[PDB]
Amino acid sequence: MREIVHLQAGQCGNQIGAKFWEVISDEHGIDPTGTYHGDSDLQLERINVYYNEATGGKYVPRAVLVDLEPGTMDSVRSGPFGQIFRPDNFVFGQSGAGNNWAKGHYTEGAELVDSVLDVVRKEAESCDCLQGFQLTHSLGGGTGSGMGTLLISKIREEYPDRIMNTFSVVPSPKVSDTVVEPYNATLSVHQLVENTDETYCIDNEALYDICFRTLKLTTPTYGDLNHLVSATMSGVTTCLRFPGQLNADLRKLAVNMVPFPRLHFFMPGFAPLTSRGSQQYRALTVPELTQQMFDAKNMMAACDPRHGRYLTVAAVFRGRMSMKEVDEQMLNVQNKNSSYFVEWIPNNVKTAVCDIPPRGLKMSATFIGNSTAIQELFKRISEQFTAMFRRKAFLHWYTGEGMDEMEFTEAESNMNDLVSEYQQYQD
Amino acid sequence: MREIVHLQAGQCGNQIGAKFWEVISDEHGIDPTGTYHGDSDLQLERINVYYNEATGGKYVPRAVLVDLEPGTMDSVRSGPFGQIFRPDNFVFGQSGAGNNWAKGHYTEGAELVDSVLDVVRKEAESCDCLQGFQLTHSLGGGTGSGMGTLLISKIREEYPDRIMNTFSVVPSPKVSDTVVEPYNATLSVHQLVENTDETYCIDNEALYDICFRTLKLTTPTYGDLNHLVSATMSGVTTCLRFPGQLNADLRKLAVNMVPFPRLHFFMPGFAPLTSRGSQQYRALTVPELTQQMFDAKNMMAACDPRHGRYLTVAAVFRGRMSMKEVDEQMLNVQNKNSSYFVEWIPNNVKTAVCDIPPRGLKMSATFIGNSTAIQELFKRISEQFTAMFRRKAFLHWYTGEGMDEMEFTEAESNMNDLVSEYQQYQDATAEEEGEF
Amino acid sequence: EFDLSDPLALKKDRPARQSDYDARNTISGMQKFMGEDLNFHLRKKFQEEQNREW
Amino acid sequence: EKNFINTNAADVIMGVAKKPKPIYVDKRTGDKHDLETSGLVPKYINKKDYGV
Amino acid sequence: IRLPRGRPVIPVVPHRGALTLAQESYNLPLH
Amino acid sequence: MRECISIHVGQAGVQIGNACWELYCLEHGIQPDGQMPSDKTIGGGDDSFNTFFSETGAGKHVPRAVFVDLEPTVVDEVRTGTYRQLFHPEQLITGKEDAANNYARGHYTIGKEIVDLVLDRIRKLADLCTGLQGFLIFHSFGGGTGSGFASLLMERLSVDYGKKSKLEFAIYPAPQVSTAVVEPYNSILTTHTTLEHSDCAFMVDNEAIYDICRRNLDIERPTYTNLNRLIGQIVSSITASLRFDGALNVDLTEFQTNLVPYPRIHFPLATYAPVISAEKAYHEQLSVAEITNACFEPANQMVKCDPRHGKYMACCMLYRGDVVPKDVNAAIATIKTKRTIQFVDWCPTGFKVGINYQPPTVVPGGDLAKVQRAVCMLSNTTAIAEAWARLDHKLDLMYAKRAFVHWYVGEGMEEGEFSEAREDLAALEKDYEEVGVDSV
Amino acid sequence: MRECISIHVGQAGVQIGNACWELYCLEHGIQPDGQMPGDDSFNTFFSETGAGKHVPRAVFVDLEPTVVDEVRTGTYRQLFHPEQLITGKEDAANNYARGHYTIGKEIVDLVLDRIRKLADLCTGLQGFLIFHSFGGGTGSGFASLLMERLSVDYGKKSKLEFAIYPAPQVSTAVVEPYNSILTTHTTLEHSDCAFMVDNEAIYDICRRNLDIERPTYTNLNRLIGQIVSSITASLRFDGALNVDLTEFQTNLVPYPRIHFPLATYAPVISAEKAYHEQLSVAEITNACFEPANQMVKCDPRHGKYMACCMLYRGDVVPKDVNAAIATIKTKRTIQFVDWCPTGFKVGINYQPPTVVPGGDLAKVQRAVCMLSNTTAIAEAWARLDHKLDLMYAKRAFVHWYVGEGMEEGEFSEAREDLAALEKDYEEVGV
């Protein structure tokens, strides 16, 4: 019906994709070998949105797993849910990306992109009507940030009128693990500003903040961060997989989100998140969901929304609830504080309501917020970039791959004018 | 329908709040885990004034717990009602205030207050129609006085038409605890005058004298004085939670006892207090209650009312009683003592009756007294402050934190302005026009 | 739709998570996380005993 | 050097009152709503660009 | 963190303590 | 065909209307559930409930009353009480936060919110009124809701209905006891705004009813229900002509013409004559002469004003029960010969009479005795100028220092309204003096 | 003889029809499977076939499948013919341009074919009943194209509009002023009478009249279905005064640009409150003119009435109607314009309104559906115009509309038309 071809590039991309596909298999009732064993007929209705059908009643994901070195996809193949992907879609290289954007964009990813485009064409034209693709990667790496942007570009000149989603993970200055990632993040956000339709900026610092102050986890690993990302990844496309009193697919959260084509950098957020010991003091109602959902700490991007004006806000509720509860909470939020919302748009909140909740849950909701406070996620990275670039810090690893130094200049200039774009509606 | 967001700052505030919430929960029928277990139906109708609804019949209080030392949170969690508080509302610091008003007001209580204001705004905007706030703290402490004054100053500028009651604890003439109590005491009164609606001064020596004379307690502890404090907090708000022949909420007491905006320092007193050996020697009648209530040896502030004049007096009664007897007793106590009531106010008594007594109690009453004998409480603090500040007794623990020397001057200037204002209203000709 | 307007609906409603394990704590609910280390103190004590004998 | 009776009266003699915010009660329970934002009073008819 | 004590009873007053001048004197007339 | 709308506003109004409507239900056959116990006639049955109760299609009678309060804890007792099924749910209006002893809350900010809801409910109740006579408003002069919102109700009703009759049942401030401090401010303001929007204003004190309950009735330590039952008996004897047979019927329009001589003096005092306990009634014959003389006793008055300190201007007398008009004639002829009872020269008549054959009803639980005769006397006397002078002095003492005016000036009411309200009642003070002097 | 072809567009249209056809099938003796366990009163909505199946005269249209598939898998699946329920492939996604220029052309032909095949069975075709919403993409875009195409092949045939206005305070979308301005600019010459309801007003009505706090969209759909059943009740049941569907346009629309009357269903009370209330004709007709009972959140006291068409149900005696409207004509609250000295159109039916199991409203013997054309709607047009002028000043969200083959001048020539509409609403009150 309305199919989504899921792509992932990189280590971080593949570990998020494993969590996401197991989460969707949880939602649609798919066992670790591929078949169906659920208890409701609603789970087979739009199961072909994410899955295909083989002989013998086997459901396979519409997934394309791309990497430049075989160990990571060997790791996801041997995981708890590695037996559900068709082994054709596993594409690897031999020499790694080396945490180098130029390698993944010119040297090693360009000689791999033809087979991956072949697989993308084979899997993306079995469907009747293709809603759009979906990419998971990070901007701080080399193969997700480098070859992933190449992948977005080549599936943009071939499928112009589709939906592009990128659940990118931009780096954080406070939690930084590679000394080169300002270059990669700048050169990838140079491409993501015009090759994507929506972009969901997620920070590892914000995920660690959530796991430390909200969930009170003793030892949060990367698996819990991928779980929190896949929560919102499943929450944004729940109305075209399940019925609802007010349906809203992926395109409706784009026309009602971006006022101008250059402003599509959002920040997700999942509302019903509770600590282990604070479970019995919680009432699962709509006001408690919407006051937790709008909180500054609950954002999955490390920018404080109280420093800027909200442009437009989504809320895709799941569960069984009345409608004026939601319609009055979203009106109360806009009425209480009129200085954090822009004045040239009368209604800044879009409501989406589904019916089927997450499994074992009474009610859930997700957040998609477009704000002018996202510019400080770009000012810090641009300042680090111009700290490194003024002395040509690590440029011999990039210029030797064959890219001119003009590319960095145009990348930082477009990051600067994106910042100045997000600044003119701050006042 | 008329909710009260509770606040408690410092060790004194938290130890008072634990006993206060125990008494409220015993009144409304809440077990030490949270589930309602009452017998009648009036205990569930107005439960939302102090409580919130959670799943399964469990009720979570409206309180916010603020401190700078985690040991006090450890002690307030180890009590018989430590499980009923929501774990998110516990806000603590890492380093204690050091018994310093300046530290807890400027350096350590500055960054910590943002999370406390976050809890307050989270928990106050979920109210059907909020009435106001309460605060229990001690002005002689470090985090209590400084962070409570900061909390009140920040709260009043965001909700400028609510009710801000403070059950503050004033320092001591006779037996004190700390050396630097006069500095914090004279720096806290400045904020309470401009930023509070009602201020209740509770003195520890008056409670000690009550426990030693009226109750004959062998070992009065802090959990023993906090019972009397909790009784006078619970008796004030009894008209909101239970029906009455004559109802008076916090705003009615606000209107009746405050003739001018700067004079809102009151004098609590609880009526049915009687020792264990003399329990069977009393006949519980309304004249007994009003005879003990107006007694000079029953106030919770160490300042007798014979040394001043009664500007206005409240008497909130609980239990089934007759209105004619109450009104004639107030009449008799006004007419017998003529020189102790001001003459430019004809009737100084506000009466209120609620027909539900406290649990176990049969009749009870609460004395709220606006007297001009409260000025002598400020006189002693002013004398001790002038004894200290004349030679920089301990200023290097305040000025090094960023405070100014001139900041200590405006404190006692405004405090003595309040003293002079009370003095001028004490001796005023009732039959006199004025310049205007 | 009496359930959406039941005044005592919150009284008969059960918490999202009751114990450390029951049926409706599955990974699509975001209520149970693997990073919460139940049996963490026991692992530290066992490893300390191994170090002691060594 | 200030008489606190003359100035306490002068602060209410040389003053102005606080004008209330118009609020209508809709139901018998006591639910209150703002009057200006809800479409009951005529507000946007008096705009400068009406009909032009 | 376990519960320390059983909380001695302190029951309500037998005859008063639950009637609020409208439960009494405003019942069924029924003389 | 004789319907009157009772508008109870405030805690005093609601608690008075509780006893009033209990006695209205008990006087007719209406159960607390709003249904008759049976239909003894095949198709007949008296329609005498039409003054107070509106019958639906099947069998249920609904009161023609509006209960207004700004605090939920007084109306919620009626809402969950015995007469819960009797009242229509939308007839009990309730605010969220109360006026709290302040006239400004009830007149400018808080009471101006629910005024539309009460006006539409009043219009809906007046729509079923076939022969509507006038409104009866119960409030108190000392509260915030009962002083401000009742005045706002008169304010709106004069605009929306014109010259329709509206009688008051006020609770006047007592001269020595009170339950508030800012009571004189509310009294002066709500007298000033309703000096002219009220056709009549029957007032009773609370200390005077305490004295009557102590002295005439045998009971000590009384509660508010004992006062409310007496006020309900007064309001039943006022409206007894509309529902029961009468030798001389007294319409509600007759009170303003036979009791208000001049366009501002409309404050008569009420008194109920044979208010005695059962064992005092056992030893006493209660003939028309005795209970006519007992109305003019200074101790038996329900307002704390000595009638010997002033001059009677007009008297309206309502009789109930086994009453011969011959004895009424003789008893009123005897009173005019007395010297301790003095009248004004320009009113040689001074009396309006009304006799109703219905004896007063005995509510169970009340302390009043079953009597065959009763008089509810409404007397307008010049002796009330003592009470206005004492209220004048009590306002004066506080207004000299401008105490408590920050609570009023900070809520949309200017200071000047005190200066003109006090000036207007200071005019009314000598307005009473001009009608007390004899022309020679 | 008296057929009526219903058309439901969008999610709002399908969910409204799911209650309307529930009420229709329960009104007659029609089971969910289409059989009847004989009178022929159902021909206004049902056409009988050779197999004994009563097929509704409705065309359920949407551009998104998963709101029509619940008709296909629900409890009323056997009742509906397969070609009636028509779905697209991609939704317009809150875009007028997508539903009017790109996606609507693929489905307009098939919907026109089903409309024509449904109109061959109608010997006495009266009019089309259209249900849609102004805020949506399909319901604002494809429905307007449906009017533009239906006005050519038929012409003078009656068309009735049952549209959902944008709410005053709440709004579930962002670009819904753009959708509203365009479907109001282009429907003006292609709609005979546009009945207006508002979601927030019905929200308040079920909050304060019924005791159901927190209703969902289903209760609103049931109230709208009750209004629609009262509107066409004279075609199926005996009445003292019968009202045809072409009388509404003649007695409610003074000028062709002004065809936006209001809705009001009078005795909408709960079963707890019906015990203490007699529900006579005067009481319900007085509750009609109370602004707390209007289904559009506006105050009619701040304007002048233009006309009034008002209907009756159940045991209604005409002299009570006479005196009850004579009372309303004497109230200073209610005012009419200079050029309408007559004011009222009256209809009386005999069928009491039908109850639904598990419903909200109580079983009553009398009911009134009042249709008022008032000048007080001019506060809504000015406010929607201001909400547009906030956004169109900085050219917000225009790029999502020029992509689907609409030039930039369409917004401007819409704003010109409804500036003229506001001028017409002001200039007739003089």
Ligand SMILES: Nc1nc2c(ncn2[C@@H]2O[C@H](COP(=O)(O)OP(=O)(O)OP(=O)(O)O)[C@@H](O)[C@H]2O)c(=O)[nH]1
């Ligand atoms: N006779 C009688 N008087 C009452 C009763 N209750 C209150 N009052 C009088 O009412 C005055 C105070 O006003 P209240 O009725 O208590 O309250 P209110 O009129 O609603 O004013 P607010 O409380 O400010 O809203 C007191 O001075 C009492 O004398 C009652 O039950 N019977």
Ligand SMILES: Nc1nc2c(ncn2[C@@H]2O[C@H](COP(=O)(O)OP(=O)(O)OP(=O)(O)O)[C@@H](O)[C@H]2O)c(=O)[nH]1
């Ligand atoms: N009053 C009322 N409005 C409804 C109902 N269902 C949907 N709506 C309205 O429908 C509008 C949005 O349109 P949709 O429901 O999405 O239907 P649509 O016209 O097909 O729009 P798209 O799905 O985007 O093509 C909102 O403004 C809702 O107010 C309902 O049951 N009652």
Ligand SMILES: Nc1nc2c(ncn2[C@@H]2O[C@H](COP(=O)(O)OP(=O)(O)O)[C@@H](O)[C@H]2O)c(=O)[nH]1
């Ligand atoms: N959320 C998340 N981020 C990860 C994970 N593993 C690595 N990263 C981030 O990815 C960035 C480096 O990218 P990398 O793991 O090498 O992916 P690759 O370069 O595309 O193969 C670092 O900044 C990490 O923070 C993971 O499991 N989850």
Ligand SMILES: Nc1nc2c(ncn2[C@@H]2O[C@H](COP(=O)(O)OP(=O)(O)O)[C@@H](O)[C@H]2O)c(=O)[nH]1
């Ligand atoms: N009366 C009384 N006084 C107390 C109680 N707890 C603490 N205090 C007083 O509070 C003062 C210490 O202030 P404290 O709150 O501990 O300082 P802080 O923690 O820095 O705010 C001492 O003088 C104590 O006498 C109590 O339960 N009752």
Ligand SMILES: [Mg+2]
């Ligand atoms: Mg009151």
Ligand SMILES: [Mg+2]
């Ligand atoms: Mg649609």
